Each structure stands twice: as C-alpha cells, then as structure tokens.
Structure 1
Amino acid sequence: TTALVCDNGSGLVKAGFAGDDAPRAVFPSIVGRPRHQGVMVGMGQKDSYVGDEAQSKRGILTLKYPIEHGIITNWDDMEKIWHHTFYNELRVAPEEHPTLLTEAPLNPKANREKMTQIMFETFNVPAMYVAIQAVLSLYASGRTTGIVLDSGDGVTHNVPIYEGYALPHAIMRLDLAGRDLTDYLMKILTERGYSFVTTAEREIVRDIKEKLCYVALDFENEMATAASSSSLEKSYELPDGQVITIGNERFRCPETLFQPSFIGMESAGIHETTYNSIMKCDIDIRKDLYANNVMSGGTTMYPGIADRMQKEITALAPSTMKIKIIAPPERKYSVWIGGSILASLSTFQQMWITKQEYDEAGPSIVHRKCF
C-alpha cells in the first residue's frame, strides 16, 4: 500500500501519494467562520470552511491560520484541516496507509507529540513518520551534500548536510516569512494611500506580493532609479476592478529578507545567516557547502533572489572559492517531492513508527525514532 505523504505549513497544505510525480492536493491552509447574521432560512448554513472554500467565500469570513511560525496553535482547526485533507480532498481512508508528516527543525517537542497522538488516536493511521523539510529538499534536488536554505510562510531555516550527516550545532532558524513580508507590504503600501485592514484584504496583498515583487540586484541604485523615473512603476487590478499603482515599493518589499532591520528585527539577512552557518561548519567541508546552496519553499521564488544571493555571498566568501546557488524552478514543491522519494524508498520501510510501538511507548516515541 502506498503511504500518504503530507506536508503541512503555514500557508499551503501539500498532500499526495508517495511515488507520485507531484502533489495531488494543494490548497491554502485556512479555517474560516462566518461573522454575519445569516438571514435567509433553510440555506444550509455551515459551521466553517476549509481550504479553497474559505478562499472563495472569504468576503463573508474571518480567516484564521492554525499554524503560525510552523507551530500548530489551535489543534481543533488543524484536525479539521487533516480531516478535509484525507476524506474530502484525497478521498482515501487513513486506516489503509502509513503517513509521513513534515516539520521545521528546532520546533517544540509537544508539536510532534500532539501530531502523532492525533494521527494514531483520531485517524487510526497504521504507521507514521516525521521528516525535516531541509533533509527532504536534498532528496528532491538530487544531492547528499549541501547547505539547504528553505523559506516558506512562517519559518526560514538553514540546515547544512555533508554526505548524509547533519551538523546540528550549525542549524539556523529565522522567523522571516512570506507572512512577515506580507505584513510589511501592507504597512509600506499604506504610504501611497491604500489600506488593507481585514484578513481577506491580506489575501489580496499576498497576491500582489506574488505577482509584482522582485528582489533588487543593487538596492540603492534601484532606489535612485525609481525616484528618477516612472519606468519601474507597475499597476494591478483589485477584485472590484479598481486599479492601484505601486512603485519602488515593489522591490522594497522582498529586500527586508536581506535587511530585517526594515521590519524591525536585528538578526542579519538570509545571506549572512547562510555564511554564518557555513562558518559554524568545520573547515574541510566548507568548499562543498559553497559549491551547493539549495533553495526551497515559496519565499525564495522572487525574481533575482538567486543572483542577489550569489553576489552577496561572493562578496562575503573568500574570493577564490567558487560560490554556486542552485534554484530549481520547481522548488516551491521540492519538500513534498523529497518526501515522496523518501517514502517510496525500500530502506525507509524499516523506519516507520508502528501502532504497537506507540501503544507500548506512548507518544514520546517520536523523539526516539524520528530524529
């Protein structure tokens, strides 16, 4: 029986069967409740919506994301999202299939404890495992050595790996995100007179960030260019058909990843945390880490982030030492593709947690077996 492979996050849920080429169910991970008094009688009013339904109705709804910063912060909505994922959206009963689940590193242990407890008790899944996102990115990109940089909604984290061994002391985690880029985009967009207050407006801001932002290769030169000229300035059509024009801001938004001081944090940008992570590695491997940098997750999709990263690391790194950035176009899904590859492997079949082992050891077993 093909195991399920499910990758949760803040933002999209990605789920599918192991051995598939691409995920079968992808939908934004939202639970929505109505906030208006239902006036018509016999409508069939429904308690809450999940995924694409909550997106379509969203004008009626408060949208709440049950995972912030890779931590599940209310378990009922998350359990609703899994219920929708297995029954409604994959249409496959969990009592048949092992399941593989994905988490950001250096998370609290209770998140794994509760996630396993809900899988065994509430879905009766015959076996489960929890993988690290960064490890799976290496399977997807076809390597056994490199420093992974993976940034989605919520967590951003670097994990160096060398011939299949992690280096836990060198793992770095940061809370820059698609989400904090969105909140920055709203707060800067206010400058030109446009105010996006409600959550369903935030989804519009998110769509503006996806369609129009791009990472400036050199920041101050494009600031001067945008001050001098309209040519950089581009416009977008809100759902009601009004048009808004956004200028220098569209490059200003994704740079905060490079300069967190804009949003107000002090920890250095993803380039300097990448360099500092390499530096925490022992000196012999470092050539191979510089040779491979693997980007993952949606927040690394911006046009020109690959070249800005390569340039700014090359400026940090010793001049002889060849720096290469590996940004595959598919990289938004590569954590799922890696999970699919891993779950398909025959060697892995040894390593699932089984229901009997859970009944014997209780939900703490996950720390022992999984990582």
Structure 2
Amino acid sequence: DEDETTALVCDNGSGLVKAGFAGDDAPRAVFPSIVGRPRHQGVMVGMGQKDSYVGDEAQSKRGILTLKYPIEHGIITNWDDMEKIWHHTFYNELRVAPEEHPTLLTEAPLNPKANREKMTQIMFETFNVPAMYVAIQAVLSLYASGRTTGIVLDSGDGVTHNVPIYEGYALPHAIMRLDLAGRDLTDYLMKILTERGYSFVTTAEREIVRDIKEKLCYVALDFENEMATAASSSSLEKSYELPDGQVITIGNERFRCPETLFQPSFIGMESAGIHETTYNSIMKCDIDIRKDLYANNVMSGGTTMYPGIADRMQKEITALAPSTMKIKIIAPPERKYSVWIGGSILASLSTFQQMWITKQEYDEAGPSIVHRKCF
C-alpha cells in the first residue's frame, strides 16, 4: 500500500474486473468475471475443500468447478458472490484495505437504478470505504480517447451499447443496448462447430472457443463471396492447436462468427446489425452534428482486439450515409484497460474530491442520496 491515501480505481466491466490504485497507468489485478463452485461434495481431507474459487485459481480449476456467472448482461444473481470476489481482489490480489481509500467504480451503461441502490447499500454496510463515486463506462472510454465529441460503441461480454456524446454531453435519448455480446458469439460458434463434428456444452470448451475467436477469427469483407471462395481455400482455411494436442481446422467460420452481430437474422433478432443501431442513434439527434458523429465514432471493449471491425464499420456507414465527408474510426491499442485509465484520470484532478460520496451522507439519506449525488 502506498503511503498516501490515494483512491481505489476499479472497473467492474461486464466480462472483466480490473482494479488498482489511483495515479497508476494500468490496473494491477485484472481477472475475468467467471466464478467456480465445487461440482461435488466433501469426503476427502488434507487440502482444498473451499467453496468459492475466483480468478486464476478458478481458471486452473475450471474442470472441477461448475462455472457460473454472477452477472450476465447486467443482471445480478447473488450479491454474496460479488462480496467474495471483491474481498479477494482487495486483500489477496490488490493487498489493500478499503478503509483508507475511496473507491471510483464504473458500471455498465443504463444499469438498473434499483441495482445501484442495493449494491451501494450492501457495499456500505459490508465494507468500510470512506467515500464513493460510480460512473458510466461510456464517459470513461471518452476520457481515454480524450475527445468530447463522438459516439461510443461499448462491446462488453453481456451487452453492446451505442451512446452518442457531443462536446462532452450525454445523449440518453439516442442511447441503445443490444443483447448481442461475447455470449452470443460463443453460442453461435458452438452450433457451427457442432455442425463441423465437434459438440461440447461445458464452459472449458467455451473458453477454448473464445480463445479461438481471439486468435483466428476474421471479419469478412464480402460475406457470401468469401464462403464461395472458401469452399476449398486450402491457404485461406486456418487451423488451431488445442491444448490437448489435436489440430482443429476452421475455414469460413472464422468470418462467419462475428458476422452474426452484423447479420442478426442468422439466429433470429428483429434488430438489424450494430451498424444500423449506430445509424439510427445518429439520426435520432439533430441533423447538423451527425457528420461529426460520423467522423468521431469510437469503439471500446475487449472484443475490439479482433481485426476487421474498423474496415467493416466505415464501409457500411459510408454505404448508409452520404460519402461526402470522410469517416475515420479511432481505437488506441489495449483499450480494454482504457476505462480504468480514465478512472485514474478522474482521480488526477483536485476537483474530484468535491463530490466524493462520503459515509455520513449515506447514513443521513440512505441509499436514496445517490439519486441526487451522482445525477
């Protein structure tokens, strides 16, 4: 722990938890949001026999544990799970006590207000954090980009959000949430791999196939033409070496998996591709600034490490929108940490401690005070 009473910066992103100290450039403890529980009961002795397993421990013990998600698309299952994982993060991973450091947290866009009230109340009772602040990840990604104008595409693991912000002003009237995310990607890839001869249901293979998505997946420039040329495609077809050692070969599926977000009709969504959701979002607001939105679009999330989103994005928007002004996307490398960086940025300036949510305000007005203290 630093000698100074600097604040805690924790991004509880929908899919990854990244925690550390204020003034740091990158979060120190970063782990996926999976939680493992003993698949069977206790009869043995001498070691183990522990209920909750979180972090890399559960990653190593994936096979023996039922792998469960305490949060999915924002919905909260069991607050005890968050209690334990935050205990682990603060003491076993961050080696910090929350008594002496206020916490800045980031929440998924348009999270329930009742969810905020309950989570804040359990937090304040269970923990002894001196002060509090929670913010939407959209403005955090904006801060990471450091440009007040643009539309943020936050692609988490449970929801994809499109949020327009002009000159550092939120536009909730033009903000939308789409239920397509990593979960859907894994599902669709699971069914295609089932049609390829490999049919698995458990979560270990879920992580294997999301790793495959991280490594080999394409974003098709032209879809049906690329499957037409991918009929044989000995060179274009790509293989992976699974940890057991078998060589699993995939061809068109590499660019037929992310395509589903662009083409939701593959597995039955009324909503069109996410580019349509950015398009409608843009036109909902006044006409004039729309061009700037076209030229200032930002994309954020862990998924963004994949190739192909930028070219597809610009080409389709230019197809939909007039091609007079030039559209260009901006995306700094390793932007999944960017939100946490913005949290540090929030703690950088000396005005931030004017609106810390202190203990006594919550003791006076209950959780309801946040309704007036954040917004």
Pairwise TM-score range, normalised by the shorter structure: over 0.9
* Residue 37 of structure 1, CA deviation: 4.8
* Residue 230 of structure 1, CA deviation: 2.2
* Structure 1 contact 72–78 (Cα < 8 Å) conserved: no
Aligned-partner Cα distance in 1 for 2:347–2:188: 38
* Structure 2 contact 131–359 (Cα < 8 Å) conserved: yes
Aligned-partner Cα distance in 1 for 2:158–2:94: 25
Is 1:348 aligned to 2:352, yes or no?
yes
* Residue 41 of structure 1, CA deviation: 2.9
- For these two proteins, the number of residue pairs brought into alignment is 371
Farther off after superposition, 342-351 or 128-137: 342-351
Q: Secondary structure at the match of 2:125?
A: helix
Query: Deviation string for 1:9-50 (max 9, x for gaps)?
Result: 332211111221111111112221121355543224211211
* Residue 323 of structure 1, CA deviation: 1.3
* Residue 175 of structure 1, CA deviation: 1.4
* Structure 2 contact 275–317 (Cα < 8 Å) conserved: yes
Aligned-partner Cα distance in 1 for 2:281–2:68: 34
Aligned-partner Cα distance in 1 for 2:103–2:316: 40
Q: Secondary structure at the match of 1:362?
A: helix
Query: Deviation string for 1:307-334 (max 9, x for gaps)?
Result: 1101111111112122111122122221
Q: 1:134 aligns with which of 127, 134, 138?
A: 138
Farther off after superposition, 200-209 or 89-98: 200-209
Q: Secondary structure at the match of 1:59?
A: coil
* Structure 1 contact 133–335 (Cα < 8 Å) conserved: yes
* Residue 360 of structure 1, CA deviation: 0.8
Cα distance change of structure 1 residues 167 and 10 upon mapping to structure 2, 3 Å threshold? closer
- For structure 1, which runs of at least 5 residues remain unmatched after alignment? none
Farther off after superposition, 339-348 or 169-178: 339-348
Runs of 4+ aligned residues of structure 1 deviating over 6 Å after TM superposition are none
Alignment of structure 1 residues 110-259 onto 2, 5 Å: 110-259=114-263
* Residue 170 of structure 1, CA deviation: 0.7
Aligned-partner Cα distance in 2 for 1:133–1:39: 45
* Structure 2 contact 36–62 (Cα < 8 Å) conserved: yes
Cα distance change of structure 1 residues 56 and 301 upon mapping to structure 2, 3 Å threshold? same
Aligned-partner Cα distance in 2 for 1:262–1:337: 37
* Structure 2 contact 14–108 (Cα < 8 Å) conserved: no
Query: Deviation string for 1:161-195 (max 9, x for gaps)?
Result: 11111111011111111111111111111111011
Aligned-partner Cα distance in 1 for 2:224–2:336: 29
Q: 1:75 aligns with which of 79, 95, 102?
A: 79
**Counterpart for residue 30 of structure 2:** 26
Aligned-partner Cα distance in 1 for 2:234–2:368: 59
* Residue 228 of structure 1, CA deviation: 3.9
Farther off after superposition, 345-354 or 272-281: 345-354
* Structure 2 contact 34–70 (Cα < 8 Å) conserved: yes
Alignment TM-score, normalising by the size of structure 2 = 0.95
* Residue 288 of structure 1, CA deviation: 1.7
Query: Deviation string for 1:96-122 (max 9, x for gaps)?
Result: 111011112222112111221122111
Aligned-partner Cα distance in 1 for 2:370–2:182: 29
Cα distance change of structure 1 residues 334 and 87 upon mapping to structure 2, 3 Å threshold? same
* Structure 1 contact 297–335 (Cα < 8 Å) conserved: no
Question: Identity over the aligned pairs, expressed in percent?
Answer: 100
Query: Deviation string for 1:171-227 (max 9, x for gaps)?
Result: 111111111111111111111101121122212122111111121122122111111
* Structure 2 contact 240–247 (Cα < 8 Å) conserved: yes
Q: Secondary structure at the match of 2:26?
A: coil
Query: Deviation string for 1:325-346 (max 9, x for gaps)?
Result: 1122122221111122123222
Aligned-partner Cα distance in 1 for 2:347–2:267: 39
Q: 2:58 aligns with which of 51, 54, 60?
A: 54
* Structure 1 contact 10–65 (Cα < 8 Å) conserved: no
* Structure 2 contact 279–317 (Cα < 8 Å) conserved: yes
Q: Secondary structure at the match of 1:195?
A: coil
Cα RMSD of the aligned pairs, angstroms, is 1.4
* Residue 278 of structure 1, CA deviation: 0.8
* Structure 2 contact 298–330 (Cα < 8 Å) conserved: yes
* Residue 128 of structure 1, CA deviation: 0.8
Aligned-partner Cα distance in 1 for 2:322–2:366: 50
Aligned-partner Cα distance in 2 for 1:315–1:109: 38
* Structure 2 contact 42–49 (Cα < 8 Å) conserved: yes
* Structure 1 contact 258–268 (Cα < 8 Å) conserved: yes
- For structure 2, which runs of at least 5 residues remain unmatched after alignment? none
**Counterpart for residue 17 of structure 1:** 21
* Structure 2 contact 52–84 (Cα < 8 Å) conserved: no
Q: Secondary structure at the match of 1:106?
A: coil
* Structure 1 contact 10–68 (Cα < 8 Å) conserved: yes
Aligned-partner Cα distance in 2 for 1:16–1:346: 19
Aligned-partner Cα distance in 2 for 1:44–1:286: 58
Q: Secondary structure at the match of 1:319?
A: coil
* Residue 293 of structure 1, CA deviation: 0.8
Q: Secondary structure at the match of 1:332?
A: helix
Aligned-partner Cα distance in 1 for 2:136–2:148: 15
